[PDB]
Amino acid sequence: QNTETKATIARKGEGSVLEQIDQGSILKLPSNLLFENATSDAINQDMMLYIERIAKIIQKLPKRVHINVRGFTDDTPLVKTRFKSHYELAANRAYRVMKVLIQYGVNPNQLSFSSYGSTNPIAPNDSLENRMKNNRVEIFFSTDANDLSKIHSILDNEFNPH
């Protein structure tokens, strides 16, 4: 039923999970592992060491892997912050992690960053734990394989009478 396994990043690394989907892998990191709070892009004192470890793991992965850093927020009112929107907050957070991965030697041609804003929650925002997961950063690992597409195009050009 489940395709998520807890992941251990730093011999502590609490709350992180690895999910497999059919078109790739998603590493999910709760807010408090990267940032001082849910509402800023300011990094916390352990941020760097976590990302270094992820970057080492990434170095074992083949070259054609594309790595997408994805940001997410909860619905926390944005009045107290310098951001215009949830999308903007999540973009800046995703972008910072990407940049740190670059500093650690991950090739920029394999990296991008995304923002989902507040509308893909993992859980109810009824606890600190759940709030940290709703403000998570994700890392999606995939490829731009097109073998199946070339087969289809090939077959289509030969065998379509339309």
Added chain:
Amino acid sequence: TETKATIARKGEGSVLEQIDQGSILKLPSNLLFENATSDAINQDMMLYIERIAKIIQKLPKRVHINVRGFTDDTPLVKTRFKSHYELAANRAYRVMKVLIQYGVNPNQLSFSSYGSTNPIAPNDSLENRMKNNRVEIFFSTDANDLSKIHSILDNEFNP
């Protein structure tokens, strides 16, 4: 996710279908074989097989081709075939054999049988029953990049 098909302007009926893990080329059995109980290929449609063979030869080794056989559910009584599974196996295999005749690498080919199990139509008519009698060719790859990515991540991260 499908359209009609032909070749050299002599082969209506055959459809190409795309599914997420590969492509399926449909060859109507009725055209393909002399009659509804034989594994003897229509010697007139060896030219459609050849075309398919020509395309396969363009595809790299990671692309595997599976020739699949399917039947209606008319009980077999006047025949030397002992089941629909066996009948479907022989038809798939005979089409496979002809691809091989036309130069296709035997190591990229296999044949399957589904018997009467997954009919395109309800079995009630030389209209409908003959829709169930078919041979499909499934094109896919042995790609495991995503599986390998997951394995490595899981090995490094999962306690």
